[PDB]
Amino acid sequence: KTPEDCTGLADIREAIDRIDLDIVQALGRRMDYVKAASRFKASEAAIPAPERVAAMLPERARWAEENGLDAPFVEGLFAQIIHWYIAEQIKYWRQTR
């Protein structure tokens, strides 16, 4: 149901649970691409790609802005996420070669 067709918290919570599961499934598939990424790193030191992160974060802020969400909170959340995936990628690189 749309937010305005929701008759109570049962409806609201079904939709929220679905959206959050979608997010979890996307973060899981995100990990697949991050591991695949390590095939195109020339060295371990290539992994963090700070210029790439610098480009990503304002992009995510813009998306926040365009979707009616506080840009600082979303951008900072994605800073945490991206740096966490980087850390995982390093660990994965080390463990698989």
Ligand X SMILES: O=C(O)c1ccccc1O
Residue ranges that bind ligand X, judged by CB under 6 A: 16, 34, 37, 47-49, 52-53, 82, 85-86, 89
Please classify residue 68 by burial: count the beta carbons closer than 10 Å to its beta carbon, then call 0-12 exposed, 13-18 middle and 19+ buried. exposed
Interior/surface letters 15-52, b for 16+ CB within 10 angstroms, e for the rest: eeeeeeeeeeeeeeeeeeebeebbeeeeeeeebbeeee
81 near its own copies (CB under 8 A): yes
Give the number of C-alpha atoms closer than 13 A to the C-alpha of residue 49, restricted to the C-beta side.
18
To the question of whether residue 13 is assigned a binding role by annotation, the answer is yes
53 near its own copies (CB under 8 A): no
User: In this structure, what DSSP letter does residue 67 have?
Assistant: T
List the one residue from 48, 68, 86, 93 that touches its own copies (CB under 8 A). Answer: 68
List, as residue ranges, the binding site for substrate: 13, 30, 41, 89
* Residues lying near its own copies in the complex (CB under 8 A): 3-4, 6, 8-9, 12-13, 15-17, 19-37, 40, 52, 56, 59-60, 63-64, 67-70, 73-74, 77-78, 80-81, 84, 88
